[model samples]
Target: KGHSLQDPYLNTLRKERVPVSIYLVNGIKLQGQIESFDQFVILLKNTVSQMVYKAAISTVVPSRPVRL
Candidate 1:
């Protein structure tokens, strides 16, 4: 879970060195509501990162595909 803020996406959050949370789309329930914007951003990044890894792996080694 991430800390709740009025504007988690604000530049101030970054300047304040707030911890960023990362999550996967499949890892979290789609119907679940996020307590903070950071959490939602984390999920988005996680999903994108996962997809990127899979894509890269697939390009290099087509024999084994990434699973997660």
Candidate 2:
């Protein structure tokens, strides 16, 4: 039940008891809310850094992503 690729990190997320978005952001020191976190990940992977802003953290940050 815990063999998924995402599961490994997801398990870590659960063990750490921090929201996945917060965990990811803390790792990247990314500045943004949850929604901006999602956008930042997408941008970091597919786009450029110019789209990100340190001010997005004050925006809407959804606790859950489509993955976990």
Candidate 3:
């Protein structure tokens, strides 16, 4: 099995409360902070919406961070 439980990347995001862009397979994109996640789904919250999505998300990438 994969390391879905207590993922390092997710843990970091949860700690920092960083903004992220979540891309779906259907070409829909959502932006929010990662509220929480489990093996099957993730919870995302933003000013506009609070939603739950399947872990089948195509990608979860940071919007932008401080540049060196």
Candidate 4:
């Protein structure tokens, strides 16, 4: 029960390599798949990759639903 709402949601997205549209609190947007993640960071990847802080992220929209 130590897991969080943040845990499974992102892990499943990573599991399927879901295409994503990520918005920042600073009003910027990026598109990619979840390359990986850590306690404090997210690996957003497409043609290349960007390592960003979880705090900078506001919203993450998947290209398709996870079929739940």
Best by TM-score: 4
TM-score of 1: 0.24
**Candidate 4: 10-residue stretch with minimal lDDT:** 1-10
- Local lDDT at 20 for model 4: 90
| Clashing residue pairs, backbone N/CA/C < 3 A, model 2 | 32-57, 34-61
In order of listing, the candidates' clash counts read 0, 2, 0, 0
Per-candidate Cα lDDT values, in order, are: 0.28, 0.35, 0.74, 0.88
**Higher TM-score: candidate 1 or 3?**
3
Candidate 4 TM-score, true structure as reference = 0.88
Tell me how far the alpha carbon of residue 5 in candidate 1 is from the true structure, in angstroms, after superposition: 11
**Residue 1 alpha-carbon offset, candidate 3, angstroms:** 6.8
Q: Write the per-residue lDDT of candidate 4 for residues 1-68, one digit (tens) a residue.
A: 66567778889999998999999999899899998998888999988999989999999889999742
Q: Where in model 4 is the C-alpha error above 4 Å?
A: 1-3
For model 4 the local lDDT of residue 21 reads: 92
Which ranges in model 3 have alpha carbons more than 4 Å from their true place?
4-6, 65-68
Error of 2 at 23 (Å): 14
Error of 2 at 9 (Å): 1.0
Which residue segments of model 2 deviate by more than 4 Å? 1-4, 22-68
**What TM-score does candidate 3 get on C-alpha atoms?**
0.75
TM-score of 2: 0.24
